[model samples]
Target: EHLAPEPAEMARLVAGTHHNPHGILGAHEYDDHTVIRAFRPHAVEVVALVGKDRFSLQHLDSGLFAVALPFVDLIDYRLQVTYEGCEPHTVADAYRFLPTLGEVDLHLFAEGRHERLWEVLGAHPRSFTTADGVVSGVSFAVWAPNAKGVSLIGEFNGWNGHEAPMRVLGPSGVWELFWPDFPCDGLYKFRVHGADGVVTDRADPFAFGTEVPPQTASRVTSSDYTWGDDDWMAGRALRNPVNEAMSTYEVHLGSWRPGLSYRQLARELTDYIVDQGFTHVELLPVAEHPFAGSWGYQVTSYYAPTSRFGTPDDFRALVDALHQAGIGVIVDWVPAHFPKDAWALGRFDGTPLYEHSDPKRGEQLDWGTYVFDFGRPEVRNFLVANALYWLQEFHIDGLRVDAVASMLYLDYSRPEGGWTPNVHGGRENLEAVQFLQEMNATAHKVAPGIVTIAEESTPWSGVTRPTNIGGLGFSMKWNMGWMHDTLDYVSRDPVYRSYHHHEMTFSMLYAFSENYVLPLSHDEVVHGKGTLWGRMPGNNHVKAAGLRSLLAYQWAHPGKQLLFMGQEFGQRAEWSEQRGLDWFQLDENGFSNGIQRLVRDINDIYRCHPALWSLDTTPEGYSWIDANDSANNVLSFMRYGSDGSVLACVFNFAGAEHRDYRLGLPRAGRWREVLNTDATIYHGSGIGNLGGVDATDDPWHGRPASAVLVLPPTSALWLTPA
Candidate 1:
């Protein structure tokens, strides 16, 4: 499996056969001379013999003969040996074929259109450089199926509208411009002049800059820096059949710890995240977002990584160090909308080139921005290629697409006549849906290991399912419904918690559509909702119980889990990056620190207990067998791993005593209590009844059955059969 034909050889072999969207070129040897043939130009070329693979050859009119060999065979053996003494690096090493642009295959729905749609990789052409690196020129290329003309522009030209006009690439509508001697060290953009003299400007398709001004081109100084991330991929690579367990720590760069640059965050946070046991660090949109509260959802510069974090190479170095520390990094990418600032992508060409012609698809009211016209080929290509650029060039581990609910519907934020109606007089955005599928498939095809997580709250079946399975082709999806449901349930008074218990566990109803990651994100902490601990109702005793109840249930829930910064401990004051992560509050004011410790304990136990995390997304590890009508707030379930390790999770929302609580256990053996919500050590009343208690047998069968375990008020517990 490791021996695949070199990427260059493979790309060249497929050139110009309706498969090479970006165009391909190949080289062969004949008569002691090497010949180069291009698919796009149909040009004949010659180069001194250097190297090659497969020693067998013959004299044929077309080129070398007896060369028909298995592609895989070429890789098994170092094909470079055959090319020993070759002229120079071949075109294959310098160029890559860009794929056609694709968009989110949004399935138009009624009401409002969705936001945060994603295009994985239709054709993502990517290359980058590090600081103090190269002096060679860089080339820009794009496929504008409908554009009459295009040009290149960027920071080097004062963010000019369009200084360098690209030559019409080929009959396929591709356009390109190679800035050979411009002293390639500044930001850049494309000033595309259409056939009608309409000019629009956009960011660099292959930017080297990490961050830049609005409308300014993102440029990176090319580098030949080599990195080492040995431990990063080692553990996963060696596991049998491999474990797909992915834990993501969602963070807002600017807000996580105000003003901490990428370099500092990398050094500081990598160790914390690794220690906390998260596999990936999911950054809130790092693409330049001018508005702090926008949470990186509103994008201004597509190519620039956000100056708020650090320089381009700083980000790269941060990722490299994370790799060294064995932590993965994913960025939240917002391609669905562009901010309405004049300096941004909005009105780049002074036309509707990036957005839709009608105001409906172009308008974003709830959030002030311009919606992208995903239906257009050029637009789709820009987004898809951008996705690839980050993954292949910057080495980002994955992407978490934001706000898909807005992209899938025409009536996204419309109150009346604002919604765009399809020809069928419905709200379906067919083009967006198709684009999503294509993009996802393309990205997966190129780099199967990179994770693509969708933030789609609607019941869009298969949003996270495998592409081949008729799904939206994402690795995972944020269970927004679960977040909303659980938060709503948790925000209430303990006296009222009984009525909302079902909402927390109800997410399992459709758990199989796509793998889900339960999220209690910064989105909830801000915007007046207050912090997690602050939302709980009651005095110290009650708050502790409430916090325990929340954590116990979260861990017991049937899905992967994530928590925002302040939520780990009960930050009663709320989230404010201006201040630290409520560390002082934990040590002095309240038992907030204890709660955080408990949250950490939850993570540790969750990871250590096979039943809690193993096979979490599949039905094999979960069961819901008890729901009593009289006890409107009680729900019981069991978690199990493939190895037969099991845990029984039960919650009694009833505020009053429930000593007569009866719940079936997963197994009947001597089950001991692992944790209890009312433990005083965690600031509760210290009703530590469950810790040393056990049920003798499984009640269902006299052989091993047991039932009727007493539960304290406003509490939950974990039970493991001894």
Candidate 2:
């Protein structure tokens, strides 16, 4: 016997368009007894799997079955459906269980104040115990408020959307389902039936793992990695980023060694970085991406490390090995925009949920991607939580936020009418600015001593300032102006470099304006831009000399330093993501090997000398010994440590040597030549002051002492008071 549902509501259930399938498809009370209903397509018969009370269900409608029990009320029971040409499968109804989310979770999610939003949504493996034993499966939850109905569709149900429709949890707009016995490794995606009657399958926005790209399915996973970086985390909290010596070796993992796994990189990269004297390793975006050519810039999976390297735990092992080696790991984070893949976050929930509805405000014209709607609370929460996830889960020491300039402006890379202004009628993207501030603040609050660096190219004020004073609160910012100006000057012929002397000297006028990181990033070595060594305007010998001088100048400059891979040695070709670096060049040529030696020695000197690193952001640490020698194509400056130690740097831009060059000194004493780029060991002309030069009491260049020195051609020299 069957107690029929309302004709109108039954029609919605049969069509798989019901907003709440639990209301009509599960156990319900009749006038005198209880009735159990189920919707199983391709089913020949259905039986109630109650304790010793199996009752047959009569076919009422298309794929609908119902049976009114003779008992007074309901009993906890499951369904056994015999499908055509298959065995009779018995399982608990997904909608039979109550909601896993509580009222507080819904309220916080609705208001977007949940910092650990990831813990609530996405696929989480949970368990329930009953008299029959323990039941273990995955609980799936998604935020698709605009969808009329969402279904858990995957191989488990033959990819049938009508088989398992989830229930909408009130006005909070979340859909949830608990599939008992669902394996943790099962591949799944959401089948969203839009309010407009269109349906689409989308990858889970909060998926912890994904199928290797070119195959778009989110895999269910748990954060079960047993990390081994206790010592690194403990020591990191006490380290001061600005005061420490931070020489970073920025690399693209895929290109650093094309097919090397994360475990392999852990051993190889750590040994190399430790040998090279780099304090940190800044990796290009390791987030899961669809395209290898984008160099991990256009990210699709915010929460997952790329499967191209290895598993999440393998990446954790990599970070662990680096930490154990006394080296910090910095990941390049991209929160600016995302690719417009249909199966991804774009047009999610059959609308512009993650992006703006208006094309002018949502589109990145240059990147051909969708800009994140920072004004949306859920969107901000997504990005903010992601920034914290890397630091918390991976034990990362720093994050270099990519494309921050693009996020800081409303009219970025846009024409006059192609963009929209903020409420205050300014070009600044106020929401993105606020999002960055909140992200930095959260990072500071949650993980002390973990640095957040900004790749902001514009003249944005307070990029590295604290948020309490209306600043962005970034720990450091890339000195893009210095990179551009210095590279431009160095790429010129030695004859014309005289005319552009200010390019080298102009950076100091505002060097201490921000906690800056002088970078020769991968941007300088790709897309026909040529390698750092290839950018030289001379033959092999002059190129080596020029590169050595450039490295010396960068190390001697008043900021933290970053050098791209293949720049340590003289790589002739430009960088490509498809291949490994040209490592053979280090042994193939003397000049290349010599340039490599120079970089190593420079790093050693930079680390050992406190005057080169300490007080990097203070004006008291720097003094212009002689800056007006543009006619002679030479610059000499003095770097002062906090403890009154002094180091002098002299650069010779011309191709000719100068002997008996009179230079000023800070005190009357012996000035030892600590590092000379033109030494014989560095494959140079071996022109430099012999041993140390004694400073005389004669006042010169407005200093208390003076000394006559020899300047090497096309070289840089570092001297310290001995």
Candidate 3:
């Protein structure tokens, strides 16, 4: 009897359409003999090597080889594949090993609740112990449900996909293969035979490391870097972010200082942040993005870090240093949309797998990207696991979800009738809403210590509310309204500020609706908007004075404060991704260094003073001394501490000074000047209340006490009970 496979199966294998090639190829035990088969398309001769014993296989038609051994006993052997003119090489058969994944994994992945999907789906280094010996190699799996077939293409096979074809694990829609003896750090990609019979190579969706941009191949890598933040990780679980003071310094790594790896940043960047006295660093999307100019908004490798800086272990070193220095790390995560890179998630498997099928719901015209298909279970699982990946693997403290407003609306940036309405005939994206709730629920369930912040620009209700009760379940939301109105108020002349004074007071009306973070984010100082120093209208000294008062107000306000890089030192030029900060301005530009000192001192005071943050999420913590002093462009308020403590802040927006202003005091007692923006040390015209004052029983502005004070032009003063 013939030992070769049937002609029909051989034809299918030659065409690369056999779904389970493992069953048709590899060694199979028969009652009388052992049949060994191999499908090497371009090979001229195939020989089996077993302990120096050679067994030549008979050539079947269409590049197929088969042999019927005399014995039925199982044997350990390798194949020597010979090309026409090239040298012959031996390889441990990739199909000889058992599947790397299990049935439970596939079932959970199909139902879309695979909590650790990243573990089973990416290229991972693995080893298997057999009776013959140990086989070490890499395991690769990818989701390509509609592909006719998929194969592993990489350096081991000389970029020839036919040399190592993969098999589908039942109906899971996931193609898997175990390439025995494939070394670590090998470059690889998936060559998919799409449903339309077109072959295209694509990057691994779950690659942990990748080649530097301008090259798309993924690298097989694993981290052995040990973490040194055991104490910080344990302590974070007990701290409540809402009750704690959060002075976040936002940074864009590419522009912070060009050409430094994460290893170097581990020491240098950590020391710099500690010197600045910030509680946390909110990095701008450390995920791998090909376009550096996009500021990491366009992500290609969702699981990998930007190789422009360093390797995966190098990033861990960077985070370890920050945590040891008592600083938390929050990275901006973009789940709303992804770019149009050919080898990325776009049209993966030659179909709309990750992206929404309809352009009305999937396309982001303004950003030229594709929105995620939030309704799909597998896609949802992919994103949810990605969030946990950072928290569990990298020790990330928080995730600031970017462009949440776009994800919430069905017709965002679209014309009338251009978008599809939901089943309820509403403009809200119902599926995206569910996706957000699930993401938050799972994130908090898995990582209790970590926090989630939403960068939502709309007035969507209950963004920071609990997910069990019709809420999005965020720890906090950025106060975009505060940023817009305050920037509008400060960018004009003092004469015009009086008429639009409501801009300064409008935020307090809704500041408590959700936990908030007052953000002077990078978006404000780019694209012709000008830097904070350039926004103020005055001479150099007057501009410095205005900015100093603004910084004070932002810090002393009810919510936490976030200042972008370069704004702390009052840089003159707008931020650019291509260049570093204008470092020379720190010394050459007058008052710049002073502004830096003022910020450092302000952060120090904010961290030590409970009145500024103790009861930040409630109305009881804040009260207006005189909310309507628009005629002189002035305002004053009181911030209360959870303990028996009180603090007062007064601001003067006018360019003219008031020599003798009567300010209301809560209680009749002596008050000390804690911080004065007009102090000469901060590069302002030295005008202030000497050092302290005693409250009199004048009963002004509903207060039981009053005090006489000197108000400086475009400045603020902080006072507390002495």
Candidate 4:
């Protein structure tokens, strides 16, 4: 059944509001049932809304009057009700969308050099108030664990650095304060004052306000309500089951489409991915960054989802809906650095609070920003707590740590005098490494079923392995090799592609050892890098062949697959949220459909063959049939699963077509062509055997089994004997 009409939209109705030349709200309650307004006049709408508030019900020609009331008159039995039915119920039944006011109070401290945020909240660490529901106040408890004194200055007292020092609570390095009148409405920041004279401001762990730069932190109270998915933990646990194959599509929620809303995305993109068979969708940082078009990379509000998309509830609805559709949602989370806005989390106590005091250690060189002082316990708690908040509050399945390599490398883009040298006198920030490990550990312990993915390009070891193995404790890391190699190979002369094919072919040696995904992410389409189509250096035919080769390589390579939105239908123009993904051009006689069809086929093949989805990182599921034969520019491999499923992938990197290319197979039987890049639908020549042939046991070179097949130029054809 369709959801009831939103009283808000109905009450604020205007011309060109509900339905336009584009589309409607999808479903709305009317008279007795529902009405669905569609895009075009000719398009049939199965459900829609069509009436004013005074005469609205479920169906167009049916029941109750659609009326809205103020929050004051919305409670108890004295409420005047509108009804076209038997007996009128309450407005709460009509729509549950309403905001409730709440409260919380806190008291803090400040010391010498009062203007500095750090001088207020000293190093003394104490216990935090563990109050539930609408917390009236939070008692400050600080344990520097190593500091002498501690002060706390916040938005509660106009951010005054000096006079408001928190009282020392205990003999231990601890401070305490109990603020009585602090409400949860305004922005607040804290500065930790340490002994021996030092101060640093930080974002209040419980903030609920606009996340502007520099002075940021929302003051929010706890919320309570019955959740839809009570089995969220169980749901998370089942995802990483050994038999599962994970493929995630990365997205920038705001820039996903031109003039698209969160509700629209919930319906359209959800359906698209479900149809495409991707296992998960990874969204760029959505943690309420104030800057537009910055792609949410600059985060100010850790707990709040960006209002740019919609509301906090709307984002939750997105994840809930996606999970219902059998797809997991991963977010691009940034804990590396923050935006420099004074009204934000930048200067909590009118001074650099969360950042380190030392200029070299406090700031980010290449980005001109303040980096998090991971050595601080409050900072660690905030970061770790924020991670848990996303999981607990939003039901997010995983996180892809963005720009982690930059955070890990201390000397990144810095000269000798510009940055502090580590103990090794090299790069890598030890503090960040420790924090990442702690973050992964905390997340796993709190939500053991949750997946942690790192988006680092550096050759970090044990990134996808268990933390017990001395690894970074991520469930997976994107295989950047496939992205770089395939992009380089395709954006070159076809005659020279063979020389670079080695780059594409050799990635699997390390790929399976690590849980990985072959990504054709947004980074490739932005910054004048050109669209995937424009990146191909050839005419239409060559372009098509290159695309085919790239796709074939991506699919045949070990691990999961990922493609940004526009790449699905061979988007010629670069991706732009100001404009859509050339959706209009997809109708060019199925030209875009060909690329779409290829993806669909690959999805189908992965589904049909267990070998493709089997756990390849483990030793048992994968075997390299050939590795060192650059002569033919051909690389062959076999994916073997314990379930009697075998997939033999053969790539012909040769510029000219091979009439009877000899590729080693797993066994002797009918070898069928599962994918031919040269097919006409994919803009290929439609050459080569269209599957179904026998693989003979005749050894080629040192292999025990081989198959003689006709291979087309720059083509990849998978063979699985029936």
* Clash-forming residue pairs, model 2: none
lDDT of 1 by residue, 1-722 (tens): 21223455443332211222223223333443333332211113323222343343322223211233222212111111123354322222122222222222222111112222222211122433412233235555554434545555554445542224454434544555444334446555555544444555655433445344433545545555565664564543343111344556777777666667888987888877777676667887877766766767887656657776667777777788888887777888887766676545554444655776664444555333467888876577667767777776667777778778778777654457657644664565776776677677877666557777788866677787666877777777888887888778878866666566566666778765567777887778876988777777777767667777877787787777667765666767767655656556656857776676666666666767878767777888887757543345777778888778888877766665566555665555467778777666666666645554555454652224555667776677778876
Regions of model 3 farther than 4 Å from truth? 1-8, 56-62, 82-89, 359-369, 412-423
lDDT of 2 by residue, 132-202 (tens): 45767899889888887888888877776576888889987889888888877888999887766778888
Question: What TM-score, to 2 decimals, does candidate 2 have?
Answer: 0.94
**Residue 218 in candidate 1, Cα distance off native in Å:** 3.2
Lowest summed lDDT window (length 10), candidate 2: 359-368
Winner by TM-score: 3
What clash count goes with each model? 69, 0, 0, 68
lDDT of every model, 2 decimals: 0.60, 0.85, 0.87, 0.61
Worst 10 residues of 3 by lDDT: 360-369
Q: For candidate 4, give the lDDT.
A: 0.61
Q: Which segments of candidate 4 are over 4 A away from where they belong? A: 1-205, 208-227, 230-233, 239-243, 359-369, 412-426, 628-631
List, residue by residue over 1-722, the lDDT tens digit for candidate 3. 45766777666677776677888778887776778888787778888776667865557767778876777665678888888778988777777677899999988888789989989898999987765578788999999898888888887667765757789988788999998778799899988878767777888999899989988888887888888999999999888888888999999988888788899889888998888889999999898888888899989888999888989999999999999999999999889867588788887887778987764445455344479989998999989989999999999999999899889886644457657645655778888999999999999889887889999987798999999999999989999998898889988899989998898999999989999999999999999999999999999999999999899989877899899999999988999889888878886749898888899888887888899998889999999999999998988999998986889999999999987788998988899998898898888888988898888999998989999988999999889999
Clashing pairs in 3: none
> What TM-score goes with each of the models?
0.72, 0.94, 0.95, 0.70
